[PDB]
Amino acid sequence: ILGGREAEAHARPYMASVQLNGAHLCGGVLVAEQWVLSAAHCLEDAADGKVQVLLGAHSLSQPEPSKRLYDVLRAVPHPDSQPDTIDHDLLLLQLSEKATLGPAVRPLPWQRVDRDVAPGTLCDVAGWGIVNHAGRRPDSLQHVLLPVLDRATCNRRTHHDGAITERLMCAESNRRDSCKGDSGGPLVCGGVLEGVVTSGSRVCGNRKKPGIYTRVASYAAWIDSVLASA
Ligand SMILES: O=C(O)c1[nH]c2ccc(F)cc2c1NC(=O)[C@H]1C[C@@H]1c1ccccc1
Secondary structure (H helix, E strand, C coil), X not given: CECCEECCCCCCCCEEEEXXXXXXXXXXXXXXXXXXXXXCHHHCCCCCCCEEEEECCCECCCCCCCCEEEEEEEEEECCCCCCCCCCCCCEEEEECCCCCCECCECCCCXXXXXXXXXXCCEEEEEECCCCCCCCCCCCECEEEEEEEECHHHHCCCCCCCCCCCCCEEEECCCCCECCCCCCCCEEEECCEEEEEECCCCCCCCCCCCCEXXXXXXXXXXXXXXXXXXX
């Protein structure tokens, strides 16, 4: 997160760190007792690397009573995702067992109504991604409040030039933004999950290249079908 601040420890009990061979790779969000939602590019080249999900965390490195690193039974990328496109960039991780819930670990309700968030709505994004242009990695969770940017502005030639489909939404990126390592994490508006940070390479903190987020309401039937797979 560029331009943000340290999050209140455990105030976002749905936040997940998706890890590959014990290192933070991407954000994620606990959406059901046994399932974490994230982005597909995060793992597209992960091969047989060990994927785990850290829940109940603030610090990546320090012990905390609520912190638990879960193994993953199954990783389920969206079947229409592809390397090198921004579309359908969703991934579901089935934990090896249902998460132990409490005040620091709780699924986040997620949007099913497939209608746009009002322009300018202030939404929260959190993560453990880079915090400056040199790439410094924070030990603890950072966050920032970002206003939703209307799709037509986001689609101007000067911005994303028509790439923002109905299944995607934008948030402003002027000096406050999600950056490398924050992808896959949640964009939360009015206490409900609205978007998942896309995980393609994007410049960080340039107002002319807004943040792009996959709209979870647009993928409700897919999320429900993977969960019913259990
Ligand atoms: O976050 C992302 O947008 C993103 N998209 C990807 C696509 C392929 C892919 F193989 C990885 C990624 C990845 N994450 C990362 O590279 C994580 C490694 C970097 C990181 C940055 C700051 C703090 C901790 C760790």
